[PDB]
Amino acid sequence: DVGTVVGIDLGTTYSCVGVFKNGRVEIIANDQGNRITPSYVAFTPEGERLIGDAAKNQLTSNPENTVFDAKRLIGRTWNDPSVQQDIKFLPFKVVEKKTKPYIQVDIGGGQTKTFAPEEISAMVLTKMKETAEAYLGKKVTHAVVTVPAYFNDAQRQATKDAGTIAGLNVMRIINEPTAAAIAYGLDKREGEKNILVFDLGGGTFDVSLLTIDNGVFEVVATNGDTHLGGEDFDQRVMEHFIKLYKKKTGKDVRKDNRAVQKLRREVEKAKRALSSQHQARIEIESFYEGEDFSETLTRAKFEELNMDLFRSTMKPVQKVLEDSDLKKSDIDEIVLVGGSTRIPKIQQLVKEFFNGKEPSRGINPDEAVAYGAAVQAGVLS
Ligand SMILES: Nc1ncnc2c1ncn2[C@@H]1O[C@H](COP(=O)(O)OP(=O)(O)OP(=O)(O)O)[C@@H](O)[C@H]1O
């Protein structure tokens, strides 16, 4: 009565859903062709609710009615210090309702709705559910959904409630780094091993020490930085290309937000390209005042702009080892998670930190959490 159960990585910035089919984990692509889906929701002036790429690609000078980063708010109270800090940086409205941080948006034609953070995330989970059902060709009722290891009781329960709203019975909550370890089959291994998970995504950086013993995972310690990810690498490059365009012409592109938003879209695309190549083409038509945008970024310029940010990721790692009474030599397994660990520099920096030890290779870092949840989901029928 559980049918085909789905594994869902419910991401701050991007979500992934996988499933076990014909003896194999399959990561499923969305109706836009992508194996990851933005954790974004938007409400058009007409009233169309967009979820995913369409929400994130859709452009206006209306940041107020596009919702994202609900994972920063999920399971938290309005008066939580983290919530107070985060809403300062969020362009949509957040109000106290039922003791919680509700999102307030215009739903179309000046009509206001408030959504609990778990209601926003249910919209995202509804998207993943549709993605899986389209691929499977049948309905889905049950999910394994992952959460960060530091997630507490109310955050875990709120993630289950998002599922309930989305029409999924979240059968199991699994910690994200455990699911990555599982994707690499690290619970098969005999003996006791020490597992370091370095998980650098779009908005957050998480480091976790796991211990495995005959299939049994224990989170020994967690560290990181909640406001460090791929997005912050994007910002550095936008500032370089905004201060290159001023000291070229004389103008200021920040005087118009729609241009800024297009530059973002393209800087992001180039950054990814630069994980494969040594230069990228940034090209946007009638960028600002009809005048056009064609510029190029090198791999090495990207690293130079972000080097201090790349190096900062090592201090939380040292901290995890400290807090767990371990030294670099006691790590049997290094696991890289998150789309930002596709960056050549990051990978170089981890391997030198571990004095040349190779990390697990083989699953798209992007996908490893959804994949491992799909391994557990597979067994569950
Ligand atoms: N090939 C690539 N090279 C460089 N960066 C990439 C690549 N692919 C994806 N990224 C970046 O990774 C980030 C998204 O990471 P991920 O998909 O792990 O998000 P997430 O699960 O929501 O994580 P978080 O919750 O930490 O934001 C984005 O900033 C994106 O630009």
Distances (CA, A) of 83 to 70, 114, 117, 157, 239: 11, 16, 11, 18, 27
| CATH fold for domain 68-123 | Defensin A-like (3.30.30)
Report the topology of domain 229-312.
Actin; Chain A, domain 4 (3.90.640)
Q: Where are the beta strands (DSSP E) in the chain?
A: 6-9, 14-21, 24-27, 37-38, 41-43, 49-51, 66-67, 93-97, 100-106, 112-115, 142-147, 169-175, 192-200, 205-213, 216-225, 279-288, 291-298, 333-337
User: Any idea which fold 189-228+313-360 has?
Assistant: Nucleotidyltransferase; domain 5 (3.30.420)
CB atoms within 10 A of CB 87: 18
CA of 230 to the centre of ligand 1 (A): 6
Counting Cα atoms < 13 Å in the Cβ hemisphere of 358 gives 3
Alpha helix (H) ranges present in 170-249? Answer: 176-183, 230-246
The amino acid at 221: A
Is residue 122 within 8 Å of residue 158, measured between CB atoms?
no
Both tokens of 124, joined, read 């995202």
Of 19, 9, 14, residue with least CA distance to 138 = 19
Q: Of 3.40.190.10, 3.30.420.40, 3.40.50.970, 3.40.605.10, which CATH number belongs to 1-67+124-188+361-381?
A: 3.30.420.40
| Residue intervals in the chain for CATH 3.30.30.30 | 68-123
Q: Are 83 and 226 in contact (CB under 8 A)?
A: no
The ranges of the chain annotated as CATH 3.30.420.40 are 1-67+124-188+361-381, 189-228+313-360
Helix (H) or strand (E) holding 155: helix 153-165
- List own/partner pairs for 297-301 with CB under 8 A and 24 or more apart: 297/237, 297/267, 297/270, 298/274, 299/274, 299/344, 301/240
Domain(s) of CATH 3.90.640.10: residues in the chain: 229-312
Name the active-site residue from 53, 199, 206, 367: 199
Q: Both tokens of residue 296? A: 């190029």
How far apart CA 93 and CA 111 sit, in angstroms, is: 14
Does 1 qualify as catalytic in the annotation?
A: no
Strands 142-147 and 6-9: parallel
Give me 58's structure tokens: 């859709």
What resolution does the deposited structure have, in angstroms? 2.3
Q: List all residues whose CB is within 6 A of at least one atom of ligand 1.
A: 11-14, 36, 201-204, 229-231, 268, 271-272, 275, 338-340, 342-343, 366
Contact 379, 190 (CB under 8 A): no
142: tokens are: 């049950």
